[PDB]
């Protein structure tokens, strides 16, 4: 259910080589809160990859600590998939966390590397969140 303490979800970004604006995935519910993958180009140059939590809510009382593994899937060999982990206390003033320089843009878009196919790149997040505070009183 949506109350699950952890989950793994993916978001495939299309026309990747042409990415210009920040893109946001649909929400995945963990601890009954909406978690999303955020991707953006940073300086073409590098891949910005972040995990967002409960950003739409106008509440300023909530907080949720979580650990997560942010991964860019290598479709040719999952052992070649690239991942980094984070630990962050999410709340209204700091609702996302990740890496602005997660991977070199030239590497992810290199057709010989196995991360891109038909100009599509798949992002994955495995999030393990603690019980939230200031939400479900």
């Amino acid at each position: 259910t949506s109350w699950r303490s952890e989950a793994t979800f993916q978001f495939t970004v299309e026309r990747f080589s042409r990415l210009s604006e920040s893109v946001l995935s649909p929400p995945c519910f963990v601890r009954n809160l909406p978690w999303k993958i955020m991707v953006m180009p940073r300086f073409q140059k590098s891949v910005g990859f972040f995990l967002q939590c409960n950003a739409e809510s106008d509440s300023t009382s909530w907080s949720c600590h979580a650990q997560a593994v942010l991964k860019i899937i290598n479709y040719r060999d999952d052992e070649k998939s690239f991942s980094r982990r984070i630990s962050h206390l999410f709340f209204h003033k700091e609702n996302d966390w990740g890496f602005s320089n997660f991977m070199a843009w030239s590497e992810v878009t290199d057709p010989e590397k196995g991360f891109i196919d038909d100009d599509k790149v798949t992002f994955e997040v495995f999030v393990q969140a603690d019980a939230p505070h200031g939400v479900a009183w």
């Binding site: 920040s22 940073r42 590098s46 972040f50 700091e94 602005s100 997660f102």
Partner: peptide, 8 residues
């Protein structure tokens, strides 16, 4: 470094 931190 990978530039860990908020999207901003």
């Amino acid at each position: 470094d990978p530039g860990e931190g908020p999207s901003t």
